[PDB]
Amino acid sequence: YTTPKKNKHKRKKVKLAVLKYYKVDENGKISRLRRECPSDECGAGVFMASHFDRHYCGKCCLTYCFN
Amino acid sequence: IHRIRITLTSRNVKSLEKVCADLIRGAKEKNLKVKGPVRMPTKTLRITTRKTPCGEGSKTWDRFQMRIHKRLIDLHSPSEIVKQITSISIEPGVEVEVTIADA
Amino acid sequence: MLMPKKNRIAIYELLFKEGVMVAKKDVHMPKHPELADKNVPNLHVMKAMQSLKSRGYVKEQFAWRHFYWYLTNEGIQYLRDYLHLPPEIVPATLRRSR
Amino acid sequence: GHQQLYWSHPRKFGQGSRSCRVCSNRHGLIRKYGLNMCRQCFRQYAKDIGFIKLD
Amino acid sequence: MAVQISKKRKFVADGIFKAELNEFLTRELAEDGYSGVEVRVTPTRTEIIILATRTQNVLGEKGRRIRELTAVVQKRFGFPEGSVELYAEKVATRGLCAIAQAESLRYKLLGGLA
RNA sequence: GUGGCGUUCAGCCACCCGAGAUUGAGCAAUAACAGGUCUGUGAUGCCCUUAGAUGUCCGGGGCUGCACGCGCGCUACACUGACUGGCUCAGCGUGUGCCUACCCUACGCCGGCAGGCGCGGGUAACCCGUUGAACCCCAUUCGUGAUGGGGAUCGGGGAUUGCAAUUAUUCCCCAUGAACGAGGAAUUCCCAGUAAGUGCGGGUCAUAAGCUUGCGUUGAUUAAGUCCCUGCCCUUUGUACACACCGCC
RNA sequence: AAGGGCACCACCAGGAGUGGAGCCUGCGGCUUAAUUUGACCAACACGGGAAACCUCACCCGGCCCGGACACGGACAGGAUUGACAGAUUGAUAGCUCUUUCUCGAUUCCGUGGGUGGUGGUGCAUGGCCGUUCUUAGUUGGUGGAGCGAUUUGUCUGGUUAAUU
Ligand SMILES: [Mg+2]
Ligand SMILES: [Mg+2]
Ligand SMILES: [Mg+2]
Ligand SMILES: [Mg+2]
Ligand SMILES: [Mg+2]
Ligand SMILES: [Mg+2]
Ligand SMILES: [Mg+2]
Ligand SMILES: [Mg+2]
Ligand SMILES: [Mg+2]
Ligand SMILES: [Mg+2]
Ligand SMILES: [Mg+2]
Ligand SMILES: [Mg+2]
Ligand SMILES: [Mg+2]
Ligand SMILES: [Mg+2]
Ligand SMILES: [Mg+2]
Ligand SMILES: [Mg+2]
Ligand SMILES: [Mg+2]
Ligand SMILES: [Mg+2]
Ligand SMILES: [Mg+2]
Ligand SMILES: [Mg+2]
Ligand SMILES: [Mg+2]
Ligand SMILES: [Mg+2]
Ligand SMILES: [Mg+2]
Ligand SMILES: [Mg+2]
Ligand SMILES: [Mg+2]
Ligand SMILES: [Mg+2]
Ligand SMILES: [Mg+2]
Ligand SMILES: [Mg+2]
Ligand SMILES: [Mg+2]
Ligand SMILES: [Mg+2]
Ligand SMILES: [Mg+2]
Ligand SMILES: [Mg+2]
Ligand SMILES: [Mg+2]
Ligand SMILES: [Mg+2]
Ligand SMILES: [Mg+2]
Ligand SMILES: [Mg+2]
Ligand SMILES: [Mg+2]
Ligand SMILES: [Mg+2]
Ligand SMILES: [Mg+2]
Ligand SMILES: [Mg+2]
Ligand SMILES: [Mg+2]
Ligand SMILES: [Mg+2]
Ligand SMILES: [Zn+2]
Ligand SMILES: [Zn+2]
């Protein structure tokens, strides 16, 4: 019954619509956009992030500081 | 021919004095040289409890105890003819444990 | 219950191949002692058969600190439809001996 | 959760990691001879274990 | 062969084995006029007889409820597979042991009778 | 058994012979109690609370804080003693743990001490262990002085347990040397291996006993009675009491 | 009130004391964000309660769901699960906030309804214990006495630790 803050509202995921990591060109063209992860668990599988600088695999948590 | 040691442990003596006397005359009938029943000192186990579920009362303790009787028989027998001497008297209060000869 | 799908089928297929399974009442245990292979802890197995008791597929009993469970006849037919087994495979409690 | 601090305080030594085998209580416990029961739940099973109040 | 244990600790862990088994099967065979155990421990198959009155229920549907009460013992207490077996006996003079008649009076009171 | 008293009944007292002529406990009726426990319980009724939870976890704190009052204790007020050295005897009992990590420890070497590092034995009448326990005993110093009685308070240092020791865990060392000269009104236990002195186990225990539960050890004074005090049992009797004298009025 | 008998939780005869001092510890009181709480001969080194953490309730903060199942939505055009870094935080709680990755139908959002609770009431109870009460006491059947509640048996006396 103290009420110092009244709420610490829970995180909501921003719910992006479609997948769309790739492109398509000249009626058929494989071209990635994000980096793949070189780990053994997801080699040529899931993608790495693209932050303001760096790349980051969300599965094995290793990130590379893009300086 | 070995020098084997049977050990008999129980919690009641009248159920152990029947099993231990079964192994003696069971091997005197089968003409073995049997060293007699050697009686170890007993082991009393004396948990003492406050007797009350709460703490209120006149401080009356509660003395539980359990004696353990242990007797051992030493034989002069080979490894085969003792097995029908061992496996004829279970009497579930007695835990017959047969050790090995050489050690 | 969050409880991933690989962590769920490995409990039911041992809850099917024997008609019973026994778990201890503590939620803080790293692995189930009998399973111990698919890295399943004691908290998932306590919350698997709480779902099965509410659906009537199992019957429990609790002696001192151990839940025990028993397949009913409704739970046998459901596990032959969720684990996708042919309609002749039985638990061990139906027939092993005479 | 999460996994690093849900049960991170070490339940080694001390009466926070010793419970009665019957009633899961942590007070008034008898650990002598490997009983590991409470002092009241011992008196229910005192004869069923095989202790006799002789004197 | 795995580890040796003391005689003062062996008899307590054996007597508290059957104190839990008696309490568990009081829960299961509650309505079968239960009346205790008698556990015959050997270094072989250790048989455990049941002294219930209505042996028609502990032996389940063609032995269902006695082949799933042996499978809970060897999975809890640490017995190896195919080692322990339970039996089902019948006590004579059912109205002469109290561990059958207190449950018998219990289901008269749970049924709704005065 | 013998003698004595007794209705010569039930029995009692003395005595002989004997290990012993009443060893200590355990269990324990009827009828009760608004006695204690929902904080022993997956014993439990109703009620309350349930996601910003009285669920559960984590981090920190508290339960130990202090003008004071009271209860159980420990150490004392010393010479029937402290001190130092030598000598010399016990009995109960525990010991590596399903989860569970945490066992009792011999011996050898390093350190003043607490302790450390190596090597073993013991799941135990097997090893610790012949449990070299203390008081006591024998010899020295002390000398009636708040003294070499008493060891509270307090500073600095050294180790051990642990994730963590500060509000000091415990232990060791060197210092600090407080009241206390045998206790007012009261009042509590106890009669034989008993009181009391004196140490050792067990429980709690990672660390640990001024507590308790057991064990030996040295070992008495007094009493073999009574109903005066405090109560209890039976009978007669009185009652305006029955919530029963903390009554009623 | 009278007559019997009894007990070192009563006394006599005594012994060691306690009450005094210092400290140990348990309660009341005060204080405190909290100093969690039960009990007042038969409470007060009692709850086997010697609490550094844990125990732990209590205090100040911060996660977590360990909210079964049913119904309706939401949804593979991904219901939702984790997380490195900066900031943020007591903290290597992705706890929130930026940032995007990842997970794949298990959850999520509501209506019901569980479930948990060292929460309340021991004056709603079980069980267990203590005490009345360590003394010798208590009850039926049949018969007798009574209108009856009840009484005799279960006793004048002697005896015994004892309705022996
Ligand atoms: Mg009351
Ligand atoms: Mg209770
Ligand atoms: Mg309740
Ligand atoms: Mg308890
Ligand atoms: Mg805490
Ligand atoms: Mg306290
Ligand atoms: Mg007291
Ligand atoms: Mg001195
Ligand atoms: Mg000796
Ligand atoms: Mg001085
Ligand atoms: Mg700390
Ligand atoms: Mg402490
Ligand atoms: Mg000094
Ligand atoms: Mg100790
Ligand atoms: Mg204590
Ligand atoms: Mg007398
Ligand atoms: Mg008097
Ligand atoms: Mg009275
Ligand atoms: Mg008058
Ligand atoms: Mg009258
Ligand atoms: Mg008046
Ligand atoms: Mg008095
Ligand atoms: Mg006097
Ligand atoms: Mg004194
Ligand atoms: Mg005094
Ligand atoms: Mg005083
Ligand atoms: Mg004093
Ligand atoms: Mg307080
Ligand atoms: Mg209360
Ligand atoms: Mg009294
Ligand atoms: Mg705490
Ligand atoms: Mg971060
Ligand atoms: Mg999260
Ligand atoms: Mg809680
Ligand atoms: Mg509860
Ligand atoms: Mg009451
Ligand atoms: Mg009651
Ligand atoms: Mg009585
Ligand atoms: Mg009549
Ligand atoms: Mg009468
Ligand atoms: Mg009379
Ligand atoms: Mg008379
Ligand atoms: Zn990766
Ligand atoms: Zn218990």
Curated annotation (Swiss-Prot), chain A:
It comes from the Eukaryota. There is a cross-link at K23, K29 (Glycyl lysine isopeptide (Lys-Gly) (interchain with G-Cter in ubiquitin)). Monoubiquitinated at Lys-23 and Lys-29 by RNF25 in response to ribosome collisions (ribosome stalling): ubiquitination promotes subsequent activation of RNF14, leading to EEF1A1 ubiquitination and degradation and rescue of stalled ribosomes. Deubiquitination at Lys-29 by USP16 is required for maturation of the 40S ribosomal complex. Transmembrane segments: none annotated. A zinc finger (C4-type) spans 37-60. The modification N6-acetyllysine is found at K20, K29. It is found in: Cytoplasm; Nucleus, Nucleolus. Part of the 40S ribosomal subunit. Part of the small subunit (SSU) processome, composed of more than 70 proteins and the RNA chaperone small nucleolar RNA (snoRNA) U3. Component of the 40S subunit of the ribosome. Part of the small subunit (SSU) processome, first precursor of the small eukaryotic ribosomal subunit. During the assembly of the SSU processome in the nucleolus, many ribosome biogenesis factors, an RNA chaperone and ribosomal proteins associate with the nascent pre-rRNA and work in concert to generate RNA folding, modifications, rearrangements and cleavage as well as targeted degradation of pre-ribosomal RNA by the RNA exosome. This is Small ribosomal subunit protein eS31. It comes from Homo sapiens. The chain holds residues 85 to 151 of 156 of the full protein.
Curated annotation (Swiss-Prot), chain B:
Polyubiquitinated by ZNF598 via 'Lys-63'-linked ubiquitin chains when a ribosome has stalled, initiating the ribosome quality control (RQC) pathway to degrade the potentially detrimental aberrant nascent polypeptide. Deubiquitinated by OTUD3 and USP21, antagonizing ZNF598 activity. Ufmylated by UFL1. Coiled coil: none annotated. InterPro entries: Ribosomal_uS10, Ribosomal_uS10_CS, Ribosomal_uS10_dom, Ribosomal_uS10_dom_sf, Ribosomal_uS10_euk/arc. One of its GO terms (cellular component) is cytosol. The modification N6-acetyllysine is found at K18, K59. It is found in: Cytoplasm. The modification Phosphoserine is found at S77. Pfam families: Ribosomal_S10. GO terms for molecular function: MDM2/MDM4 family protein binding; RNA binding; structural constituent of ribosome; ubiquitin ligase inhibitor activity. Component of the 40S small ribosomal subunit. Belongs to the universal ribosomal protein uS10 family. This is Small ribosomal subunit protein uS10. It comes from Homo sapiens (Human). The lineage of its organism: Eukaryota, Metazoa, Chordata, Craniata, Vertebrata.
From Swiss-Prot, chain C:
Methylated by PRMT5. Methylation is necessary for its interaction with NPS1, its localization in the granular component (GC) region of the nucleolus, for the proper assembly of ribosomes, protein synthesis and optimal cell proliferation. Signal peptide: none annotated. GO terms for molecular function: RNA binding; structural constituent of ribosome. Transmembrane segments: none annotated. It comes from the Eukaryota. Belongs to the eukaryotic ribosomal protein eS10 family. This is Small ribosomal subunit protein eS10. It comes from Homo sapiens (Human). The lineage of its organism: Eukaryota, Metazoa, Chordata, Craniata, Vertebrata.
From Swiss-Prot, chain E:
Belongs to the universal ribosomal protein uS3 family. The modification N6-acetyllysine is found at K62. There is a cross-link at K90 (Glycyl lysine isopeptide (Lys-Gly) (interchain with G-Cter in ubiquitin)). The modification Phosphothreonine is found at T42, T70. This is Small ribosomal subunit protein uS3. The modification Asymmetric dimethylarginine is found at R64, R65, R67. Changing S35A: No effect on phosphorylation by PRKCD. Residues 21-92 form the KH type-2 domain. Component of the 40S small ribosomal subunit. Identified in a IGF2BP1-dependent mRNP granule complex containing untranslated mRNAs. Interacts with HNRPD. Interacts with PRMT1; the interaction methylates RPS3. Interacts with SUMO1; the interaction sumoylates RPS3. Interacts with UBC9. Interacts with CDK1; the interaction phosphorylates RPS3. Interacts with PRKCD; the interaction phosphorylates RPS3. Interacts with PKB/AKT; the interaction phosphorylates RPS3. Methylation by PRMT1 is required for import into the nucleolus and for ribosome assembly. Sumoylation by SUMO1 enhances protein stability through increased resistance to proteolysis. The gene is RPS3. Changing S6A: No effect on phosphorylation by CDK1. Greatly reduced phosphorylation by PRKCD. Abolishes phosphorylation by PRKCD. Changing T42A: Abolishes phosphorylation by MAPK and translocation to the nucleus following exposure of cells to hydrogen peroxide. No effect on phosphorylation by CDK1 or PRKCD. It comes from the Eukaryota. It comes from Homo sapiens. The modification Phosphoserine is found at S6, S35, S104. The modification N-acetylalanine is found at A2. It is found in: Cytoplasm; Nucleus; Nucleus, Nucleolus; Mitochondrion inner membrane. The chain holds residues 1 to 114 of 243 of the full protein.
